[PDB]
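Input record (Table S2, row 201):
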Amino acid sequence: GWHEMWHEGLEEASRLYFGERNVKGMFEVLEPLHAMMERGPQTLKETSFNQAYGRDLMEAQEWCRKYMKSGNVKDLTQAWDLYYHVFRRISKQMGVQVETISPGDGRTFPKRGQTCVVHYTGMLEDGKKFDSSRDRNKPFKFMLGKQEVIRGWEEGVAQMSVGQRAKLTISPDYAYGATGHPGIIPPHATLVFDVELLKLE
Ligand SMILES: CO[C@H]1C[C@@H]2CC[C@@H](C)[C@@](O)(O2)C(=O)C(=O)N2CCCC[C@H]2C(=O)O[C@H]([C@H](C)C[C@@H]2CC[C@@H](O)[C@H](OC)C2)CC(=O)[C@H](C)/C=C(\C)[C@@H](O)[C@@H](OC)C(=O)[C@H](C)C[C@H](C)/C=C/C=C/C=C/1C
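Output record (rapamycin immunosuppressant drug complex):
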């Protein structure tokens, strides 16, 4: 929906402008996204999106249009300041979110080459548990940085200190995506893991 379309679109428009110096391409990504705003929100989530980001997106569009008439890059810079703020806020509900359950030592973090020793419980977004190392009564061990584990763990556990317990809420893009894991994880599943970093080996 609107959250995912704007997140993907802002990223791609920014790759075209900043990465490829292609203003026309960036415009052609942004303009349809603004156009679909104009019918108004039609779901509760689109309404929430509009309330949160509608005004800033409308202003960003106005700076873009000022740019087409001035050719002054300062007007585009003002547009992207707004688009980036919207992007960062949308991003807080995607990827992986780390919420501390109990603090760690705040000083010892995973480093390259080390093995993380953790306890975890994985649940679907509703709360149905699908796996737990705590049920096997033994810690799970893995290494970060080599795509051994889903992206939400790669990014989430890397931020935890030894002794920390944290809740990782992982969007499907950062977990098992459209395929899921047959027999365990459905397609397009947001996952919630209760993870405790026990030690580094
Ligand atoms: C019996 O229990 C399974 C774990 C189950 C599978 C099903 C899922 C619901 C789940 O229940 O775990 C689960 O809770 C889960 O989602 N996990 C496990 C805990 C870490 C986070 C997540 C995960 O990434 O699993 C991982 C997920 C399922 C698949 C990987 C996701 C990242 C992606 O890049 C990889 O592409 C290939 C595949 C599984 C793992 O954590 C194991 C450790 C890692 C792998 C299998 C791959 O990294 C593999 O790549 C060749 C390796 O290099 C390994 C070390 C080679 C050795 C011989 C294989 C070990 C296999 C161990 C299997 C184990 C303990």
